[PDB]
Amino acid sequence: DVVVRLPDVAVPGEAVQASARQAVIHLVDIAGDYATKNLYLWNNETCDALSAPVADWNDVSTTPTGSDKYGPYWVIPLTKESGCINVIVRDGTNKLIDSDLRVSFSDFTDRTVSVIAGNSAVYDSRADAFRAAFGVALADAHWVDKTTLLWPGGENKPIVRLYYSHSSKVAADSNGEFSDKYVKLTPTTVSQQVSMRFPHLASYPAFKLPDDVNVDELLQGETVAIAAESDGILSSATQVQTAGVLDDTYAAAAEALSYGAQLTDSGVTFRVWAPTAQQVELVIYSADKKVIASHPMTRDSASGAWSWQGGSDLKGAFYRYAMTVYHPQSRKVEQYEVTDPYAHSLSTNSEYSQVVDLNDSALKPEGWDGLTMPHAQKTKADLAKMTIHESHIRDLSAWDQTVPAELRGKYLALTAQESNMVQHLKQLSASGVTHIELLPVFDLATVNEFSDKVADIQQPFSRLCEVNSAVKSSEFAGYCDSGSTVEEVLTQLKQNDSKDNPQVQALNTLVAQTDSYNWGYDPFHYTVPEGSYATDPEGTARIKEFRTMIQAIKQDLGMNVIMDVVYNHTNAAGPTDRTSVLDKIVPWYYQRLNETTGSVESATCCSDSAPEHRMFAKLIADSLAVWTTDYKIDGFRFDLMGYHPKAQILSAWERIKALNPDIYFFGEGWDSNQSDRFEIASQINLKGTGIGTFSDRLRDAVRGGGPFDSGDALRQNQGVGSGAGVLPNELTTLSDDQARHLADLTRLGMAGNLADFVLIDKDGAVKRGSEIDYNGAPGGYAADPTEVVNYVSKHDNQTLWDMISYKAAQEADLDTRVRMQAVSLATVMLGQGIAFDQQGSELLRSKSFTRDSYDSGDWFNRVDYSLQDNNYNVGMPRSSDDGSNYDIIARVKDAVATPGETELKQMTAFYQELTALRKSSPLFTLGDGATVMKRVDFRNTGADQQTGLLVMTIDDGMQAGASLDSRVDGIVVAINAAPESRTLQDFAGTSLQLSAIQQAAGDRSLASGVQVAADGSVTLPAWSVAVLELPQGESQGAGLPVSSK
C-alpha cells in the first residue's frame, strides 16, 4: 500500500510581520486573481482598534498590500495594539468566509494572522494554516452502517481510507507519514436501507469497508477518513460521525435490554448503554458521598451495554458511572463520572444518582395504587371535553400567604386545602376545568437545589448579596446591609421605574441568577422529579411528595394531570459541562449534529437531541413508561414536537398505550426544519393519527398579531378579541377584509380546525378549512377536533391581558377590557377543539408586558390568589428581550386602571360560566370530525356579515342523526366581539331559550342584557356571549341542520 503523507512542498513562511500599530492578515491560497480580493473593516463597540477604516461597504479598494504564491496579505493600521478588529474577507462585495471574523490581539499577540477562504478559523501563521489545511479538519464523513461510509471528500480520489487510533489522535508523524492503522475503502452504491435512514445524506459519495471489518475495534477510539491522490499525498482528512453504525451494530441487541439501577427484592442489576467506552466502572457512594466501592462493569458484546449485578442491600445507595471514553469533540479519551441517564432518584442538585424501587410502599401516599383518573379519555367525545389549566409549581404558591410557608413553591402546596390557591383550583374544577398541565417537573438544571446557594425575593437583601456576587458588585450593593427584603426593595423601586429607568428589571435580572425560579425547559434527568419543588431534595423523599401532589390533584381536586416533557434537547453536551449526561456516556450519539462540522445543533435553544436514533427513542419511551405507570400521569405535552420524527412519536404512543390504554399525547407541532432528515411530527403530518397539536390559527386570529411582533406592531395587530376592524386603535391599519379573515380562522377553529370542514368565507365563497390561509399555510389541518388544542394564552409569549392592553382602543374602558378577555376565551372554551389556557387567565393575569418570562422570577410571574390585583404595571419588563417595546408600553400602559378585586371576581365568574357551558351539553365536544361536519355550521358569514359577530350552530335535529342531548334539538353560540348591539334575525319563528347556566348568573353573566323577543329575534349587547338552546319536546325535533354548500 502506498503510504499517505503530507505535501512534500515547503511550508510557507510569513509574508510580513506586523510592526507597531499594525495588524497583518494573510489569505492563504490553499486551492493549488488577487486584485479583486479586499477587506471590509469597521469598528464597533466590542472591537475598536482600527485606524480610520473605510466606511463604505461598496468600496472594494482595500486591496492586498502584497502577495506571493501562497496568497495575498494586508497590512492594516491600528490606533492601539490591544483589543480586536472586525474583518470580512471578500472578492468584490462577496464574502469569501461566511463567518464575520474577529481577530483578537490577545489570542494573537503578534497581530499577524492567517485565514483560508471557506474556513472560519484564524491561525497564527501561514504555516499553521497550511498544516491545518492538510490535517484532520471538520467531521463531514458519516459511518452509517457496518460497511458504508458516506463522505464527499472521497469522491474521485484513488486512495480513500478509514484510519484509527485507540488511545491517541490520528495525525502525521515526524516523517510526515500517517502511520496509524487503517481500513481501505472502495466506491460503492448506498443501500436503500441506508438511504431511507439518512435521506439528507443519500446524495453523498458512498464507500465500502471490507465485510470482515472489526467494527468494535475502530469504534473504541478516534476514527478519521482520509483521501489521497495516487502518489499518496493527502487530499483531505476529517473526523467520522458514527451514530448510524452504532445503531446498525448494537441497537437491536441493546433495545432488548432494560436500563438503570433495576432494584427488585432479589437484588439489583445496573445497566448503562456505552458501546464506544473503553471502560465503565460503577462507583458506589455512601450517604456522605464517600466512595465505598468502584466496580468494573461487564460489557456485553452484542449490545455494547455494560452491567453489574449485586444485592438488595444497595437499595438507597448513591452511584455514578466512571467512564473511560473517546469524545470526538475534544478528541481525547476522557475520564469522568456521570449520573445515570436512567436515574430514578437523585441526590441534591442531581450530583449522584440513587438506587430506588419506585414500587416500594414507603414511596407512596396512602391509597396510591387505587388512584383513578377522574376524567375519561377513551373515546374522542371523552377527549374533546379536555379543558386544560397550564400551571407552574412556583406560579401557583410562591405568593400565597395562606399556603404554609414551608410549602410555598413546593409540590405539597397542592395539599393545602385551606389555601386561597387550592380553593380556587377546586372551584375551577367544579366549574369545568378538567386537567392541570404542569410545566417541567422532571429534573431541571437551571435552579440550584442546594438551598444555601439560593436567595428568593421574600428573603433579606443581605442573603441575596451573600449568594450572588453580581448583586454585591452592582449599583444595588448599598441595599446589602439594609434591613429590607428583596421584594421590599423591588416595591420601592416601582414609583421611579419607567422606560428611561427600568430599575425593577435591572435588579430582578440579577436576582434571577440565584433564585428558585425557572420554567424548567432545561432537562438534566428525564425520569426523576425536580428536587427544588420538594421539601427535601436529598434522595428519595421527593418521589413520595410528587406522588402526594398527583393524588391531591386527581383525587381531591378532581382533575387529570398532563406533564410537559422536553425530549427535543438536553441542557448541555460535550465532555466538560456539569449537565452533559448523555453526551458524556455515548459521545456524538444522543445529539443531532451538523453534517459538516459535527457541532451539536442548537435550533431548539440548547443542545438538540436525536430522537431519530434508536436508543434515544428507547430512552424516551422508557421514560414515559415510568411517568405513566409509576407516577400515574394521564397525558403528555411534547415541547417542540416537530423536532421528533412522526414515526418516533407514534411508536412511543403504541408503547405507552400498552400500559395505559387511554393516555393522550399532544405537542407543539411547529415546523422544525428537520423534514430533510425524516418525516416530522408536525400539525399536517399528524392528521388522522390521534396525536394532538397546538393550533396557532385561532390563537393568533383572536389575540391578534404573533409572537415576533415588536414596537408599534404590538398595538397595530389587533385581534378578534380586541376589536380588529370594529374598534380600531389609533395606530392600526387593519381593513374590514383583514378583520373578516381573522373571523374565518376563528370560526374554523371553533369547529375544530378541520382540513375538510366546509364554511362560507368572508367573500361568500365556499371553502374547506384547508383553503383558509393562515400566514401562508393551509389553516385547517386536522381530521378530528381532538387533534387540535385551541388557546389564546400560554406560558410563552405575552399573556392575554397584556395583549389586550397593547391592542385595545384608548376608549375601551376597563369593564370592556374584562369582557374582551372573556370573549377571547369564549372562542376556545365554546369550540370543538380541546381547550387549553394559561393559569390565571381567569384572574386577568399580567406579566407587566413580559413576553418571555422563563427566568423573570416570582416578581413578573406572580399570580395573586388573594385577588388584590393582576400583577399589571409592576415595572418595565426585562430590557434584553422587551427593550424594543418600552416606547409602545409607555404609550399604552396607563390607558385605564389596573384590575382590582372587583374585576378579578367578575372575570373569574365569566371564566367559570364559560367552562360550565362547555360541559353543559355533549354537543360542544363531539370529538369525531365527521360528526362535527354533520352538525356544526355558522351564520353571519360572507360579504354582508356584521363584523365581529360569531354565530355557531350545533345541530341535534333529525337531519344530524341521533339526538345526542335529550334536553335540546340544537345550540346557538353567539359571540358579539364588537362595541355595538347586534340583532340576530335568522332564528325567527323558532323560540330559542338562553342557557339556564347563563340565566342563573343574572347580571353577572356574559349574556347579561341579551333579549329574546316574541318574534324570535335575539339581541346581544356589546362584548357579550350567549348560548341559546332549542328545547327538545316529546320527540327529537327539526334542529339546526347544516346548510348544503
- Kindly tell me which of 211 and 944 has the beta carbon lying closer to Mg ion: 211
* 409 to 448: interface string for Mg ion, x by CB under 5 A: ----------------------------------xx----
Q: Determine which residue in the list 48, 68, 91, 124 makes contact with Mg ion, applying CB under 5 A.
A: 124
Task: Specify the amino acid at residue 422.
Answer: V
Q: Determine which residue in the list 144, 251, 486, 512 makes contact with Mg ion, applying CB under 5 A.
A: 512
CB of 395 to Mg ion, least distance (A): 10
- Kindly tell me which of 518 and 729 has the beta carbon lying closer to Mg ion: 518
Piece of 242-250, 943-951, 1005-1013, 1028-1036 that binds Mg ion (CB under 5 A): 1028-1036
Q: For residue 529, which of 513, 552, 547, 514 has the smallest C-alpha distance?
A: 547
**CB proximity list for 695: less than 8 A, separation 6 or greater:** 683, 749, 753, 788, 789, 790, 791, 833
- Kindly tell me which of 466 and 965 has the beta carbon lying closer to Mg ion: 965
- Helix or strand or coil: residue 351? coil
CB of 335 to Mg ion, least distance (A): 25
**Interface with Mg ion, residue 864, by CB under 5 A:** yes
Which residue is catalytic, options 545, 639, 700, 903? Answer: 639
**Interface with Mg ion, residue 1032, by CB under 5 A:** yes
Burial class of 276 by CB neighbour count within 10 A (0 to 12, 13 to 18, 19+): buried
Piece of 215-223, 273-281, 508-516, 733-741 that binds Mg ion (CB under 5 A): 508-516
Q: Determine which residue in the list 863, 917, 949, 974 makes contact with Mg ion, applying CB under 5 A.
A: 863
**Interface with Mg ion, residue 405, by CB under 5 A:** no
**Interface with Mg ion, residue 110, by CB under 5 A:** yes
* 360 to 379: interface string for Mg ion, x by CB under 5 A: ------x-------------
Determine which helix (DSSP H) or strand (DSSP E) holds 976, and give its type and residue range.
Answer: strand 968-976
**CB proximity list for 547: less than 8 A, separation 6 or greater:** 363, 364, 365, 368, 631, 632
* 518 to 537: interface string for Mg ion, x by CB under 5 A: x-----------xx------
Residue 905, C-alpha cell as written in the block: 371576581
**Interface with Mg ion, residue 937, by CB under 5 A:** no
Q: Rule CB under 5 A: which of 880-909 touch Mg ion?
A: none
Please tell me what DSSP assigns to residue 528.
Answer: E
**Interface with Mg ion, residue 1033, by CB under 5 A:** no
**CB proximity list for 369: less than 8 A, separation 6 or greater:** none
For 303, 403, 491, the CA distances from 409, given in Å and listed in that order, are: 43, 10, 21
Classify residue 884 as left (phi > 0), alpha (psi -120 to 50) or beta: alpha
Taking the C-alpha atoms of residue 353 and residue 584, their distance in angstroms, rounded to an integer, is 15
Q: Rule CB under 5 A: which of 153-172 touch Mg ion?
A: none
CB of 934 to Mg ion, least distance (A): 14
**Interface with Mg ion, residue 612, by CB under 5 A:** no
Taking the C-alpha atoms of residue 604 and residue 117, their distance in angstroms, rounded to an integer, is 30
**Interface with Mg ion, residue 32, by CB under 5 A:** no
- Kindly tell me which of 222 and 497 has the beta carbon lying closer to Mg ion: 497
CB of 845 to Mg ion, least distance (A): 6
Q: For residue 147, which of 180, 193, 115, 87 has the smallest C-alpha distance?
A: 193
Sign of CA dihedral 610, 615, 619, 620: positive
Q: For residue 589, which of 565, 564, 566, 619 has the smallest C-alpha distance?
A: 619
- Kindly tell me which of 115 and 254 has the beta carbon lying closer to Mg ion: 115
**Interface with Mg ion, residue 357, by CB under 5 A:** no
**Interface with Mg ion, residue 497, by CB under 5 A:** yes
* 171 to 190: interface string for Mg ion, x by CB under 5 A: ----------------x---
**CB proximity list for 996: less than 8 A, separation 6 or greater:** none
Piece of 144-152, 393-401, 804-812, 838-846 that binds Mg ion (CB under 5 A): 838-846
Burial class of 675 by CB neighbour count within 10 A (0 to 12, 13 to 18, 19+): middle
Q: Rule CB under 5 A: which of 722-781 touch Mg ion?
A: 776-777
Piece of 208-216, 786-794, 823-831, 856-864 that binds Mg ion (CB under 5 A): 856-864
CB of 602 to Mg ion, least distance (A): 11
- Kindly tell me which of 308 and 411 has the beta carbon lying closer to Mg ion: 411
**Interface with Mg ion, residue 145, by CB under 5 A:** no
**CB proximity list for 728: less than 8 A, separation 6 or greater:** 718, 734, 809
Piece of 281-289, 312-320, 794-802, 948-956 that binds Mg ion (CB under 5 A): 948-956
- Kindly tell me which of 221 and 970 has the beta carbon lying closer to Mg ion: 970
Whether 393 and 407 have beta carbons less than 8 Å apart is answered as no
Q: For residue 75, which of 83, 87, 92 has the smallest C-alpha distance?
A: 87
Taking the C-alpha atoms of residue 807 and residue 394, their distance in angstroms, rounded to an integer, is 29
Check if 668 is active-site. Answer: yes
β-sheet with 181-184: strand ranges across: 181-184, 159-165, 222-228, 234-241, 141-145, 148-150, 206-208, 186-188
Which residue is catalytic, options 668, 761, 852, 903? Answer: 668
Q: Determine which residue in the list 965, 980, 981, 994 makes contact with Mg ion, applying CB under 5 A.
A: 965
Taking the C-alpha atoms of residue 696 and residue 779, their distance in angstroms, rounded to an integer, is 9
Residue 189, C-alpha cell as written in the block: 452504491
Q: Determine which residue in the list 119, 485, 609, 963 makes contact with Mg ion, applying CB under 5 A.
A: 963
CB of 536 to Mg ion, least distance (A): 8
- Kindly tell me which of 517 and 546 has the beta carbon lying closer to Mg ion: 517
CB of 401 to Mg ion, least distance (A): 13
Q: Determine which residue in the list 357, 639, 903, 956 makes contact with Mg ion, applying CB under 5 A.
A: 956
Q: Rule CB under 5 A: which of 292-331 touch Mg ion?
A: none
Backbone angles phi, psi at 816, to 5 degrees: -65, -40
Piece of 89-97, 467-475, 566-574, 954-962 that binds Mg ion (CB under 5 A): 954-962
Sign of CA dihedral 662, 668, 670, 672: negative
Taking the C-alpha atoms of residue 256 and residue 622, their distance in angstroms, rounded to an integer, is 12
Q: In 318-331, which positions are buried (b, 16+ CB within 10 angstroms) versus exposed (e)?
A: bbbbbbebbbbbeb
- Kindly tell me which of 718 and 861 has the beta carbon lying closer to Mg ion: 861
CB of 966 to Mg ion, least distance (A): 6
* 791 to 830: interface string for Mg ion, x by CB under 5 A: ----------------------------------------
CB of 42 to Mg ion, least distance (A): 6
With contacts defined by CB under 5 A, how many residues of the chain interact with Mg ion?
A: 28
CB of 16 to Mg ion, least distance (A): 11
Whether 504 and 494 have beta carbons less than 8 Å apart is answered as yes
Q: Determine which residue in the list 306, 517, 533, 801 makes contact with Mg ion, applying CB under 5 A.
A: 517
Write the DSSP string, 431-494. Answer: TT--EEEES--EEESSS---GGG---TTSBHHHHHHH-HHHHTSTTGGGTTSS-BHHHHHHHHS
Interhelix angle 696-703/736-750, rounded to 10 degrees, is 140
Q: Rule CB under 5 A: which of 65-84 touch Mg ion?
A: none
Residue 777, C-alpha cell as written in the block: 399555510
CB of 890 to Mg ion, least distance (A): 10
Tally Cβ neighbours within 10 Å of residue 296: 12
For 292, 470, 837, 950, the CA distances from 226, given in Å and listed in that order, are: 46, 49, 56, 67
Q: Rule CB under 5 A: which of 549-578 touch Mg ion?
A: none
Taking the C-alpha atoms of residue 578 and residue 524, their distance in angstroms, rounded to an integer, is 9
Which amino acids are annotated catalytic?
639, 668
Binding site for Mg ion (CB under 5 A): 55, 110, 112, 124, 187, 206, 366, 443-444, 451, 497, 512, 515, 517-518, 530-531, 776-777, 843, 855, 863-864, 870, 956, 963, 965, 1032
